[model samples]
Target: MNGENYFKLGSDSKLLTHNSYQNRLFYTLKTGETVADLSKSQDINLSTIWSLNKHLYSSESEMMKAAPGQQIILPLKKLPFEYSALPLLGSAPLVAAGGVAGHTNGSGSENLYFQ
Candidate 1:
């Protein structure tokens, strides 16, 4: 598949695709695509991307760095945040991603993904 079902969560949420959880809604980070850019292009919330990528990103600033080979919506990236304040993006940051050859890292291991 080229990518996953990018959805929006709000007052009027909508489904843009028919898909699965562990195997759904994944976007390989691309060059020149910040979380905001991805959120804009993918129709997903920057907050959603933040929540869905805890394993892939350690902090909000870290998230600003786009990891291209890293397939997003990582099955193991979601974190339980029922207590903390909601995530938010303040300033935008630079973005970049790259693939070695024909392989995109779908391995789900954070250590193996982009640096």
Candidate 2:
């Protein structure tokens, strides 16, 4: 399928499919759409969506960068609470936990950290 048509079909298919854990993760990362819309289109229960997402968790930095608006209900490891107390954004450097490198816009230095 052509790129444009693929997107259209993919979105329609996603809407029709049940709100699987993978789809919730995709919507969270994308953030351009809402869980409610996804649930409605997928004909799934809202509680199921919430329950599925409950199992998924991320670090504070990951949460901050990803779903910044959502309240973090899960515990995040390796997050320095002191950093949250600080006012400045760059006062303390944001470090990445060891794992696969993340995809980002090509405009920043690599900031990987090991603990």
TM-score for every candidate vs. truth? 0.39, 0.25
lDDT of 1: 0.57
List lDDT for all candidates, in order: 0.57, 0.44
Cα lDDT of model 1 by residue, 44-110, tens digit: 6676667557656776667776666766673444467766576564423333333343375433345
Clashes of each: 0, 0
Candidate 2 regions exceeding 4 Å error are 1-31, 57-115
TM-score for predicted model 1 compared with the true structure:
0.39
Best by TM-score: 1
